[PDB]
Amino acid sequence: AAASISNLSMQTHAARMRTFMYWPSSVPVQPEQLASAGFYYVGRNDDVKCFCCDGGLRCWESGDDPWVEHAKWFPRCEFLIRMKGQEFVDEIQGRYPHLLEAA
Ligand SMILES: CC[C@H](NC(=O)[C@H](C)NC)C(=O)N1C[C@@H](O)C[C@H]1Cc1c(-c2[nH]c3cc(F)ccc3c2C[C@@H]2C[C@H](O)CN2C(=O)[C@@H](CC)NC(=O)[C@H](C)NC)[nH]c2cc(F)ccc12
Ligand SMILES: [Zn+2]
């Protein structure tokens, strides 16, 4: 069974892509990578949200993988779990935050 979707209007990849009209060229993550991972542009800075879980992410850095960030921050997202599988999410959740030594 499928649970709630926060934003039905953005459930399609094409709809999410259309939001990235004014995506800043300086950001080292591309609209297609974001849209594929469920994200659409909110229209300010580099803020995006997931159509399913309504999780917002910003301050995208060089080397960021939207699927990994999705799983790092919103592991309970149903779209994420169905697209990537629970094992992907669990792996990401076991990996981050990186271990710091001392206790
Ligand atoms: C940087 C780490 C993280 N980014 C990354 O890891 C990137 C990929 N890779 C390195 C990130 O973006 N996060 C981590 C989570 O925390 C959620 C998100 C930050 C965020 C919060 C987000 N997540 C939180 C977690 C908390 F425990 C406390 C507050 C927050 C917030 C709100 C932040 C903190 C403070 O409230 C001000 N604030 C704002 O968004 C202010 C900015 C003017 N503006 C507003 O409120 C407007 C009007 N409404 C939202 N709200 C958002 C809304 C968005 F559309 C986009 C991102 C956010
Ligand atoms: Zn999500």
Curated annotation (Swiss-Prot):
Subcellular location: Cytoplasm; Nucleus
Name this protein carries in UniProt: Baculoviral IAP repeat-containing protein 2
Homology family: Belongs to the IAP family.
N-terminal signal peptide: none
PTM description: Auto-ubiquitinated and degraded by the proteasome in apoptotic cells. Upon stimulation of death receptors, including TNFRSF10B, recruited to receptors and cleaved by caspases. Proteolytic fragments remain associated with the receptors. This cleavage presumably inactivates the protein.
Record remark: domains: The BIR domains mediate nuclear localization.
Highest taxon, organism lineage: Eukaryota
Function statement: Multi-functional protein which regulates not only caspases and apoptosis, but also modulates inflammatory signaling and immunity, mitogenic kinase signaling, and cell proliferation, as well as cell invasion and metastasis. Acts as an E3 ubiquitin-protein ligase regulating NF-kappa-B signaling and regulates both canonical and non-canonical NF-kappa-B signaling by acting in opposite directions: acts as a positive regulator of the canonical pathway and suppresses constitutive activation of non-canonical NF-kappa-B signaling.
BIR repeat extents: 13-80
Reported tissue expression: Present in many fetal and adult tissues. Mainly expressed in adult skeletal muscle, thymus, testis, ovary, and pancreas, low or absent in brain and peripheral blood leukocytes.
Native source organism of the sequence: Homo sapiens (Human)
Binding, Zn(2+): C50, C53, H70, C77
Assembly and binders: Interacts with DIABLO/SMAC and with PRSS25; these interactions inhibit apoptotic suppressor activity. Interacts with CASP9. Interacts (via BIR domains) with TRAF2; the interaction is required for IKBKE ubiquitination. Interacts with E2F1, RIPK1, RIPK2, RIPK3, RIPK4, BIRC5/survivin and USP19. HSP90AB1. Interacts with UBXN1. Interacts with GSK3B. Interacts with several death receptors, inclusing FAS, TNFRSF10A and TNFRSF10B. Recruited to TNFRSF10B in the absence of receptor stimulation. When TNFRSF10B is stimulated, further recruited to the receptor and cleaved by caspases.
Lineage, broadest ranks: Eukaryota, Metazoa, Chordata, Craniata, Vertebrata
